[PDB]
């Protein structure tokens, strides 16, 4: 009594009001922007969906007793919304269900009444006009049954409900809604379904069936137009291609669909991370590092989002092969716990010439390296150490006898030194030249001058940028 | 002083890292411990140091006698005198808290000061209490404590009473010197040399001058170094008594490099034995060596390393290896040769320098306007 | 052997443990790849005579030939004159049996020790100061986007 | 935003750039370099 | 590089003010 009766008053008040008014305002705005301003892409619909994704999902995992959030289904289960009294009475029913739940015990679902709270919800003269509301209130029950964090008696229901919602949205878009483009929401739905499939493929077989379904799903897109649809499906599919079945790489290399220019910024980071991974695994290193750094600064601004850790654990190896990382710059407070234990010991061994310590660290942390799915290091990093030494020699000296590098890089012979330096110059790490006569290695000509035709080539790019920005800005000014 | 002696802190450091040096310092460290009956700290140190000697009984009984005498005095005062604020009870518990700081651990003393700070209304007493907190925090290098109370003093109080504040323009810098960061700050605020409390303000004058010289030679080399330190008769007075330091300065200024390295070896050796400076000895030696190398490399454009082999020290291969190490790291702005031993210096023309600066400052700003425009507009 | 090194590693992802600890058959080709990633070459010819499976020489001969021709290509020489004895040191084996083959198409001479032939020197020839036709285009374009917005 | 990537598994001296153990301090190296010549 | 830039920053400033004012005038009537 002291823990259940006394803690009952505090809980009931907040979910009774704040969540209900939240979904009320969101539905009102959705109805307003679907009725007027058919170009309703720019609205609070996306902000509402993001807030529901961020805030409402985490506030609860259990079935929300005392009819606070489980009661919404028995509220909207009978909705007509044909004329003014029908919509008014459906809102009144919502209010009355909230009042009853705050006064007495309202309708409860015992892990099996959600289908009647879902079948009857689409029954009782339900309104198609709020198709987005149907989708939202059908997907929200997924996350509770998904984020129940139990994975018992809810994953199967999750899969069935997901299939129901997918079928509903496919039949809805079969009519090709006019001046509405519900896809702006559908995408999230799609992602959500993939979620449970992963959960399904975490509780059962992988997402190959999902793979076929989503090939069909992007095929039904890309035809009319694209509105944030394909931009999600592509990275979902190449996520599954690389999801513990990553051994498949050959194909996606021929995924030649253009990636849409105007996309949600958060997704561009996923796209560039996966492009970097695929580029680096097949041994191209010039483009990989630059595009991955472009990815990192694209959308990192958050309090420890989490995958920045992984991109760092990749950019360190992918640029270890070519030079030096900021040795102490990036080991700060978030990543410090992980990155430091293996990667720091590595780069420290790499700058030094200690092969035995390299083997020691490899033996110690190979399990962690394989767990991260980045075991390329032994494959190439162990046998490409001498490249760094050649780079250093390039930076310091400008005229040296190749008979000296052998004692400087412990090669013990001049001829194989000639071979390795020639290979390095052909690879383009250094542009020196060799006198094949008397053990003479010379640098290229001095830097000619920094103001002949190489500068203005950059200022042209910057003008293109600046004038483009000004035009983009001036166009979309004051719609009404 | 409020703290019994920062000297004792220096001593404990001088005895901690070297076990071999557990002979000379302890000889008077034990005397300083037994005197004043500041017993509470040394027990653990004695667990770390030499084993034990039976004196805890008498030290405990005398500390307890003083404790109870002071407590009875203060309670009788609070029962007979009924004034608050800056009244007699306040100073009685000042005596108690000061005795705790002098003798015991920091927790009880700091709690006493916490319970007495709200009692005051006079700003001078608040400044005195924050000074007590600064001294006790700097005694054990409790970083967050001093970071909080320095801001407390410098913001909440420093708008009324003045000139009793120059006692603090030398403590900001004690902190900025114990941590490697910002030698520039300490150099530019140890600029004043009218020090006040000779030993109540921690270290003695002469040590203060050696510290200002030591830091200053880094933050500014020959951008009017002379008009600040060479023309400073006030420090020329005291360094006239110390030959080593004046030899060091005038060896670097007059371009006499061999004696300069001798002196720097001496300075590095003695800086090893310190408390505030010991962590950064090895950032000093390296950032001085490189300054001298670039100072001589200027005024030449094609030098022969056989010339530095003598005009700067000895050991052709030695300067070879050092030049290699420093050039690779992006410093000692030049290039090298090996077949005929001719170090050639390259230096960007002004125009190239300005072009290189703009090419990055601009695109950095462009990236920020890019992100701004992307967040706005949906 | 057929110099598809790019598609080599991308097939090596599938094998989690049999490629290192045991199973000599997979061990051999990755080891040879590692040997040929460093400038080490003589070790390849030294270790050629150890194959765990059957002869498989039908590919090892082609691999040796491709390595030879790649190493030759790396020694790209602008100067038409190089001492042929330097090539003789390289693993070209017979003094004129294959020297004639390179001589027919490649430059230098076949074991002369004073090579004479066409040169591979390259000069930028960027003396021309006239990108005027296109640079004028660019400038007019800037004027184009300073206007025509109303 | 949550990416389902399961991220969750001393001195304020700032950046230390690159320091490598030399063992011998400058005083030792130069002190005995001079002895040779 | 020094005349285009201060021609874009002005345009962003004007856009920010416009969106602020238009949305404010919208919610004021709602």
How would you summarize what this structure contains?
Chain C: This is 26S proteasome non-ATPase regulatory subunit 8. With 378 residues, chain B is mainly alpha-helical. Chain B has helices at 6-16, 24-34, 39-48, 56-80, 88-103, 106-117, 123-140, 143-157, 172-178, 183-189, 205-219, 226-230, 233-239, 243-253, 257-271, 281-297, 305-311, 316-328, 350-375; strands spanning 302-304, 342-344.
Terminal CA distance of chain B: 63 Å
The global form of chain B is globular
Pattern of helices and strands of chain E = H
Strand content of chain B: under 5%
Radius of gyration of chain B: 28 Å
> What is the number of beta strands of chain B?
2
Structural class of chain B: mainly alpha
Order of helices and strands of chain B: HHHHHHHHHHHHHHHHEHHEH
User: Strand order across the biggest sheet of chain B?
Assistant: 1-2
Q: Rg of chain E from C-alpha positions? A: 14 Å
Helix content of chain B: 55-70%
Q: In terms of structural class, how would the helical and strand content of chain E be classed? A: mainly alpha
Assign an overall shape of chain E: rod-shaped
Distance between the termini of chain E: 44 Å
Largest sheet of chain E: none
Number of helices of chain B: 19
**Helical proportion of chain E, percent range:** over 70%
Measured by DSSP, the beta-strand proportion of chain E falls in under 5%
Multimeric state: part of a larger assembly
PDB class: cytosolic protein
Keywords: protein degradation, macromolecular complex, ubiquitin-proteasome system, cytosolic protein
Entry title: Cryo-EM structure of human 26S RP (Ed state) bound to K11/K48-branched ubiquitin (Ub) chain composed of four Ub.
Chain A: 26S proteasome non-ATPase regulatory subunit 3
Descriptors:
part of a larger assembly; 5 chains; C: 150 residues; E: 30 residues; mainly alpha; 83% helix; rod-shaped; Rpn7/CSN1 (chain B); 26S proteasome non-ATPase regulatory subunit 6 (chain B); Rpn7_N (chain B)
Structure description:
It is classed as cytosolic protein. Keywords: protein degradation, macromolecular complex. The structure is cut from a larger assembly and holds chains A (480 residues), B (378 residues), C (150 residues), D (37 residues) and E (30 residues). Helices cover 58% and strands 2% of the residues of chain A. Chain A contains 21 helices and three strands. Chain A has helices at 13-35, 44-56, 72-76, 84-103, 116-122, 131-139, 142-146, 155-174, 183-203, 208-219, 230-241, 265-281, 286-296, 307-320, 336-351, 355-371, 376-381, 386-396, 402-408, 414-427, 456-475, and strands spanning 399-400, 433-435, 440-442. In chain A, 26% of the residues are buried. In chain B, helix 4 (56-80) runs antiparallel to helix 5 (88-103) and helix 10 crosses helix 11. By secondary structure, chain C is an all-alpha fold. In chain C, 47% of the residues lie in helices and 0% in strands. Chain C has helices at 6-9, 24-37, 42-47, 57-74, 84-89, 99-105, 132-146. Classes of the chains: A mainly alpha (480), B mainly alpha (378), C mainly alpha (150), D mainly alpha (37), E mainly alpha (30). Chains in contact: A-B, A-C, A-D, A-E, B-D, B-E. Chains A and C meet through helix 20 and helix 21 of A and helix 7 of C.
